[PDB]
Enzyme design. Structure first.
Site, PDB file in Angstrom:
ATOM      1  N   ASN A   1       0.835  -1.192   0.000  1.00 41.60           N
ATOM      2  CA  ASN A   1       0.000   0.000   0.000  1.00 41.60           C
ATOM      3  C   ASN A   1       0.873   1.246   0.000  1.00 41.60           C
ATOM      4  O   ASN A   1       1.775   1.377   0.834  1.00 41.60           O
ATOM      5  CB  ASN A   1      -0.940  -0.002   1.210  1.00 41.60           C
ATOM      6  CG  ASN A   1      -1.798   1.222   1.267  1.00 41.60           C
ATOM      7  OD1 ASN A   1      -2.649   1.451   0.390  1.00 41.60           O
ATOM      8  ND2 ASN A   1      -1.590   2.033   2.301  1.00 41.60           N
ATOM      9  N   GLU A   2       0.595   2.155  -0.934  1.00 40.02           N
ATOM     10  CA  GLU A   2       1.328   3.414  -1.065  1.00 40.02           C
ATOM     11  C   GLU A   2       2.837   3.191  -0.996  1.00 40.02           C
ATOM     12  O   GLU A   2       3.565   3.836  -0.238  1.00 40.02           O
ATOM     13  CB  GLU A   2       0.843   4.416  -0.010  1.00 40.02           C
ATOM     14  CG  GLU A   2      -0.660   4.721  -0.208  1.00 40.02           C
ATOM     15  CD  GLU A   2      -1.214   5.810   0.695  1.00 40.02           C
ATOM     16  OE1 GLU A   2      -0.522   6.243   1.656  1.00 40.02           O
ATOM     17  OE2 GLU A   2      -2.370   6.237   0.439  1.00 40.02           O
ATOM     18  N   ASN A   3       3.316   2.246  -1.803  1.00 40.52           N
ATOM     19  CA  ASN A   3       4.760   2.053  -1.823  1.00 40.52           C
ATOM     20  C   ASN A   3       5.495   3.161  -2.576  1.00 40.52           C
ATOM     21  O   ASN A   3       6.720   3.111  -2.681  1.00 40.52           O
ATOM     22  CB  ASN A   3       5.096   0.687  -2.409  1.00 40.52           C
ATOM     23  CG  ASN A   3       4.502  -0.440  -1.598  1.00 40.52           C
ATOM     24  OD1 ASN A   3       3.539  -1.078  -2.027  1.00 40.52           O
ATOM     25  ND2 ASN A   3       5.058  -0.687  -0.410  1.00 40.52           N
TER      26      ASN A   3
END
Ligand SMILES: [K+]
Ligand SMILES: [K+]
Ligand SMILES: [K+]
Ligand SMILES: [K+]
Ligand code: NA
Ligand code: NA
Ligand code: NA
Ligand code: NA
Ligand code: NA
Lengths: 779, 781
Positions: free
Chosen positions: B399-401
């Site tokens: 997630n949201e890397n």
């Protein structure tokens, strides 16, 4: 400890957080915007010295914090010497400590109490060769320090100890520049014969790095006794009739070392003294040939509101207060203490016993032993110049098992021998000591057993017997630790009815009422006995000042060892004047009961009145009537013959004493109520505003029976609350700065910050049997 | 996690301390006497599950605790098997964990969200073969467990995440006995075609240790569909046939059962497993098909977070919450940013909720080998431990890397490379499901299904721009799924509509920075999104963020400090009025909700007609104001807002009664609210008034009111207000709720806190945090 006179204390502009961070990068990384994820956790702005446990040591409801914490700051580093060295100097930090320049770890340390340093010269220079240094930090140097006081069984001292293993940068941190070549160690060994005829100085100088350097000796009166210009060394000089240092006359010579190079002058000024001392086998103790009675106390690195983080100005006040009591001797708790204390002991005149923190628990593995070896070494080398120091202690209560599954007297005995040999190899000049380990008593030079007459064992009237039993159980005897707890402001009426009276009891630890009334007698007895023991070395009463211990959740002041003669903020108990009237030569005069507002007894019953005075004659007055001028005589116990038995009016009485000493006349005055009504069990709490201060209001809770008589007997815990959780002065460890505290003669008080008013203050018994009382404090 | 139907939850008689101890010996050593030095530090008696941050996550004045702590207890260990094996099973513990039998370390774990076990069999034995077992503990076994949630940038998830990295034994610990030979793993792959004509059951079974064993498959009715006995071999495989199987779906969560059974020495090891027949497909550039029919995913999220307990939710709490979600009409849920309790998965299987579950590779960049191994390990554990659940259709990889900051470097190509390794690992482990990630544009091509970031009306543009942004997102990726949208609302804050730069005061850009965080705004935003979704045939679906207010370390200054307020229900499960907006669109069960149950005082000019919105799925709804019918109206989703069920109405000064009746055939539904109507306007706040409005046997509700210098309530006041009390335990605080917060922004000039009745009498104080108003006090009987 770098030898130089020019140093900067780093006290301002620090940030601190009481937890570990995810990495040094997390500590150093920039903030990209408000509210962004890297803007939490939140840090605190603090001033150093700082202690993790300034408050929670004495918080009644929590275990004092034992874990990591971080500090960080920006430094402007301007080393003015070409190729100069730059150091951060730690006068003391607990317990484990790591130092970073930006993301690079520079140094680490294990040990709460020795001095150490971190040479940052290379990291600083390397950081300056990167663009980040001026583009992001504008020249400054980012510095971060991790301190940890997590529980560690393999680190000394043991958490079984009766004091806090404080965490934090609680002693000064200094920024120190030196030139390329500089002083690294200046050892001064002054010696003299017991008659003071011949003096011998002996200066060893170790340089760092590698033109001439000078070396001057000055007399206590500032006279240059002699000069040496030399070249890049050891050095020794004779003196005839050296002025001798003693507690009474703490005369100090000065050695000045100068290195000049590039026209700048590295100078280091240091003090030392000549004195001879001897612990006579099976006998007393001699200082410069004459027998001296060691009149000793203790202190901890602890104080109200700050934990271990005391300032120099606080240390001066306290040591000055100890000097005015008449002490000539002090054991610096169970660890090396601030160089400020040692210099005060040299300047004011107190002999010193300083020990390493091998304190309870048994014996650990190899890094454990290496910490002991290292700290003994550091303590001796860092403090050996001080004339005040005469004993190096090696451990305290090492017979106390519990930190390991095993406890091996043989292994402890062997290691204790190793330490004794190391101390004598390192400093032949002084003797070694331990306290309370019977199976090592022979190893050291000066032994102390455990003797607590009337507190943990027997009656205080058995002191002399027990003392001589101790003098005969060991080669060289010193009595470290005696006395007992007193809840400041609690008192008790003498009742001359299975013992000489109600104060003549065995082991007041579990049988006493912890009143000042009892301990004043106990101190008094001991000091009287000491006037007729010419072969006693001396003793050290434990302890000067109420201090925080994690071991006593349920003491009248929770988590506070109450064996001081002075409260944790320095406020004297009445026992302070007991010691002062026996030991000080400055004429004084203290009626016992300034902190005793209400006395009790049957109507017309004559009431005992004690004065503690070193005046040879004192006259007492009750309500204006002289009760007779009596003469001071230590043998007429209690109060050295200065006691009366006078009648008190119901209600208020004015009690007065005049003291005479030659031409000098002293005066003192107390007022006390006299209550003839008897009292039942406590029934209500009455809140009163006793008023107090330009910034503080004093709120008093009072325990009364169903007919409204104060229960002068009551010891219940009382708890304070407030609609403003910052208005109460709390967690100080004192009589008026505690949120939970046992009543003292049915009474409990707490201070309220005036600027926070108006508020409502509540008072409750902790058992919640009485109704909670409320009082409106307007200001 | 061992498959056996026979296990014991260890909930009672634990001790806990929130700090490290000096050694395991110091934890285990005996008490020599009352008041002796080993009597401190003091420990707490706690009941599991337990969390370090039950209160301090939302305490407005402290950083939530991140560090070590210890648990200890005494166990009666009675293994009923010849050379049986005894394990402590951990359904979840954060973040790093170490397990000790007496002074011997057994096992350690890194990762706060997957299941793992510690085999204590040999240490229990070697300990019984010592005298201290009998002499000191009387044959019982001493257990200690060290948990740590210290900050660690080389551990996922990142502390930049918008949730707490909770500490402690916040999921059940089980004592579990198995025979010398036992089931290790039981993998069940039910496969069916998109119209449900045939079904196949491939079953793979692995044994620990190393005769035959049994295997039966029961219908969703309990009727045996098929049976096998087979010889015991270390790994086995079996494939069973089945005609027109009952299909699992959210609407109809038919579950089959597989029972494996092994006997030795007379004892029967049994394990029961559920599974489901379902077929699903994400269409390229198209929507989502379940069992051959297009199905718009109606999704939410949940965190493992709840008022008063942090992560320490009980099974009963999870039942209550999952039912609340199901009753809202959702059919889909993304389980936060980590593997969640198996209890949640079973509830999704059972109530009918499709599942997206991801590993906590959540923000910060990418760490070293240990960091990468933890991600590979947790992906492996998540898939292996949950693959039998039919509810699960998506494994998320991160997630949201694209969010940097935990390291000095940020290497997009290294992140791509590791993302691609993780995608291949998942498809190799479980070919039957799709991989997803959220918000990483430079990796979006790697996975099967992709979500960008789209928060119309919240973090970007207006909520009326939703369809356009959604269409752009669908056009920009092979297989699209909208994960996360919605916005914050301070429960109990509202705002009158005003038509005077936009359609009205609610037609705004980026309400996160520009809105007032009222329920009034978010209700319109949810309404719009939901009515747009009815006109989007290509949309697979979405998951709004999020079901329930939850604690986050990142928002110290939110109207409820440290609470992410994007839920449609409060952190204790109390519904906001937005919960009914969703319910009116998604639930098949007739309902009717007048908007304004939590809106006590309306305002406007005298006699001015005032808007009333109603959220109902009933075809027709009639509104009544003060007894006077205002008209029967027909429900029409496209007639925004409130799907046509809206009236403008006069309100008189003072109290007003507003009722509604909805008709669904013969079902007459009813709802009613009362509201004051205030025509006086107000100046700036000037005084705080306290009153009490207690209606519980346990609590009093105290209310602070901000009023102007003429006594008029300031109905748009948002000042933080702080409560105090002469009794520091009377106030119900640190809950993260509207009435359980010590400091909270006012809701239309109003803030309230519960007071515990037992502790009364006390005195409560209320102040504005800025200290410009004078503190108020009230005595509470
Ligand atoms: K404490
Ligand atoms: K220790
Ligand atoms: K918090
Ligand atoms: K992390
Ligand atoms: Na060690
Ligand atoms: Na140990
Ligand atoms: Na102290
Ligand atoms: Na890092
Ligand atoms: Na929540």
């Amino acid at each position: 400890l770098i030898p130089t006179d020019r140093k900067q204390r780093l006290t301002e502009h620090w940030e601190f957080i009481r937890q570990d961070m995810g990495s040094i990068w997390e500590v150093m990384r920039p903030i990209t915007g408000a509210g962004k994820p890297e803007t939490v956790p939140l840090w605190q702005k603090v001033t150093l010295p700082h202690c993790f446990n300034a408050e929670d040591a004495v918080d009644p409801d929590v275990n004092y914090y034992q874990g990591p914490g971080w500090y960080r700051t920006m430094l402007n580093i301007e080393n003015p010497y070409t190729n100069g060295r730059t150091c951060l100097e730690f006068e003391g930090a607990g317990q484990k400590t790591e130092v970073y320049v930006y993301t690079t770890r520079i140094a680490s340390h294990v040990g709460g109490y020795d001095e150490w340093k971190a040479d940052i010269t290379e990291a600083v220079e390397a950081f300056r060769r990167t663009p980040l240094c001026r583009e992001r930090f504008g020249g400054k140097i980012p510095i971060a320090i991790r301190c940890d006081n997590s529980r560690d069984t393999e680190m000394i001292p043991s958490d079984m100890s009766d004091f806090n293993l404080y965490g934090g940068l609680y002693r000064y941190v200094n920024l120190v520049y030196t030139p390329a070549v500089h002083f690294e160690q200046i050892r001064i060994e002054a010696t003299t014969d017991e008659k003071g005829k011949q003096g011998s100085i002996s200066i060893d100088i170790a340089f760092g790095g590698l033109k001439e350097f000078s070396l001057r000796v000055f007399s206590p009166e500032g006279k240059e006794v002699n000069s040496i210009s030399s070249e890049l060394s050891s050095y020794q000089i004779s003196l005839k009739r050296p002025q001798l240092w003693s507690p009474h006359s703490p005369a100090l010579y000065t050695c000045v070392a100068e290195l000049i190079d590039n026209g700048d002058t590295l100078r280091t000024t240091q003090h030392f003294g000549f004195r001879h001392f001897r612990f006579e086998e099976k006998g007393p103790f001699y200082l410069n040939g004459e027998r001296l009675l060691l009149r000793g106390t203790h202190r901890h690195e602890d104080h109200a509101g700050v934990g271990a983080a005391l300032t120099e100005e606080m240390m001066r006040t306290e040591m000055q207060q100890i000097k005015e009591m008449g002490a000539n001797f002090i054991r610096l708790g169970h660890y090396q203490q601030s160089g400020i204390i040692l210099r005060l002991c040299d300047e004011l005149g107190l002999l010193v016993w300083e020990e390493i923190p091998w304190c309870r628990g048994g014996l650990g593995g190899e890094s454990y032993k290496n910490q002991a070896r290292r700290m003994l070494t550091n303590m001796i080398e860092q403090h050996r110049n001080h004339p005040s120091v005469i004993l190096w202690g090696l451990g305290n209560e090492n017979d106390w098992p519990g930190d390991f599954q095993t406890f091996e007297k043989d292994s402890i005995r062997a290691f204790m021998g190793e330490l004794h040999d190391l101390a004598h190899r390192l400093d032949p000049t002084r003797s070694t000591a331990i306290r309370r380990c019977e199976f090592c008593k022979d190893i050291v030079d000066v032994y102390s057993p455990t003797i607590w007459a009337g507190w943990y064992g027997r009656r205080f009237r058995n002191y002399r017997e027990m003392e001589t039993a101790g003098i005969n159980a060991t080669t060289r005897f010193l009595h470290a630790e005696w006395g007992g707890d007193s809840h400041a402001g609690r008192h008790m009426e003498v009742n001359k009815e299975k013992g000489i009276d109600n104060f003549d009891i065995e082991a007041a630890d579990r049988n006493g009422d912890w009143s000042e009334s009892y301990i004043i007698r106990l101190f008094d007895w001991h000091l009287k006995e000491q006037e007729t023991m010419p072969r006693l070395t001396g003793s050290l009463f434990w302890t000067f000042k109420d201090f925080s211990t994690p071991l006593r959740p349920d003491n009248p002041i929770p988590y506070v060892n109450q064996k001081g003669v002075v409260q944790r903020d320095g406020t004297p108990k009445e026992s302070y004047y007991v010691f002062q009237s026996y030991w000080s030569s400055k004429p004084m005069l203290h009626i016992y009961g300034h902190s005793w507002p209400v006395r009790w007894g049957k109507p017309g019953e004559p009431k005992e009145i004690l004065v503690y005075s070193n005046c040879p004659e004192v006259e007492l007055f009750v309500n204006g009537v002289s009760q007779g001028r009596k003469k001071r005589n230590s043998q007429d116990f209690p109060a050295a013959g200065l006691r009366w038995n006078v009648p008190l009016r119901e209600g208020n009485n004015k009690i007065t004493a005049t003291g005479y000493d030659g031409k000098l006349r002293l005066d003192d005055e107390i007022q006390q109520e006299y209550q003839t009504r008897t009292w039942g069990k406590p029934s209500r709490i009455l809140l009163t505003q006793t008023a107090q201060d330009a910034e503080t209001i004093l709120v008093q809770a009072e325990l009364i029976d169903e007919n409204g008589i104060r229960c002068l007997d009551a010891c219940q815990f009382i708890e304070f609350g407030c609609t403003d959780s910052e208005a109460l002065l709390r967690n100080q460890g004192t009589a008026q700065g505690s949120r939970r505290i046992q009543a003292a003669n049915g009474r409990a008080s707490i201070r309220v910050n005036k600027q926070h008013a108006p508020v409502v203050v509540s008072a409750s018994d902790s058992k919640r049997i009485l109704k909670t009382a409320l009082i409106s404090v307007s200001g």
